[PDB]
Design a protein around this ligand. Structure first.
Ligand SMILES: [Zn+2]
Length: 257
């Protein structure tokens, strides 16, 4: 299977997933001086007040917190989006050290981690259909930097012991994703892909300009998870991020000047 090691990592993915070398791959480096300010971009509208989280799961590559997407409870709209995108899950990519972990980079600058809040276009009926459309997904990317503790992230950090190994899951109800949002909603946006196989080029990426701060001890907890399943040799879940891909035929627009 694919992974983040030297023998099954990002550099090998193209052999099973040819699209890895596609024309719309993510992540990319955001060059702030080449990003085009676009005054026609509308403000993002993040409506997470009726969000219903269900559980948290260690899937061997990261841990996903899943939400009930049977109805328009937690939706994202506005910005560069047409229609309404429903929140289905969020996860993080992090490093073994504080100076690496994010997937997207700003002027080559890497952050400690990167939060991905995955939403799917409701016009497509279900998540499985949406991934097969060029405008099927809308992912909000938020950079994490080490500084002070994020109160709203502690609930997540506390449950990690319970899902230490691949395959483990735990009930994770009543979690409010609004506690993970930065103050400002300014962003850069561009057409891209999923950053893990199958690497489908179905995503409109919305990367927030402002990072949130988390504590060193909080990020430390992440690093204690395992890629492996129970009973197998322990491989710490660290550096589960894909490096920047060439921009090719694309433009990154900014919502701010
Ligand atoms: Zn991701």
């Amino acid at each position: 299977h694919w992974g983040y090691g030297k023998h099954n990592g990002p550099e090998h993915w193209h052999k099973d997933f040819p699209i890895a070398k596609g024309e719309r791959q993510s992540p990319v480096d955001i060059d702030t001086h080449t990003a085009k300010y676009d005054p026609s971009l509308k403000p993002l509208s993040v409506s997470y007040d009726q969000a219903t989280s269900l559980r948290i799961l260690n899937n061997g590559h990261a841990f996903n917190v899943e939400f009930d997407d049977s109805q328009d409870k937690a939706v994202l709209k506005g910005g560069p989006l047409d229609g309404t995108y429903r929140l289905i899950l969020f996860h993080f990519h992090w490093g073994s050290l504080d100076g690496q972990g994010s997937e997207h980079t700003v002027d080559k600058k890497k952050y400690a981690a990167e939060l991905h809040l995955v939403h799917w276009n409701t016009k497509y009926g279900d998540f499985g259909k949406a991934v097969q459309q060029p405008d099927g997904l809308a992912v909000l990317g938020i950079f994490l930097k080490v500084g002070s503790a994020k109160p709203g992230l502690q609930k997540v950090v506390d449950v990690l012991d319970s899902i230490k190994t691949k395959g483990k899951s735990a009930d994770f109800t009543n979690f409010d994703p609004r506690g993970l949002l930065p103050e400002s909603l300014d962003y850069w946006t561009y057409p891209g892909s999923l950053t893990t196989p199958p690497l489908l080029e179905c995503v409109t990426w919305i990367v927030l300009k402002e990072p949130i701060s988390v504590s060193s001890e909080q990020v430390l907890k992440f690093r204690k998870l395992n890629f492996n399943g129970e009973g197998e040799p322990e491989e710490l879940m660290v550096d589960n991020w894909r490096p920047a891909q060439p921009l090719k035929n694309r433009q990154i627009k900014a919502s701010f000047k």
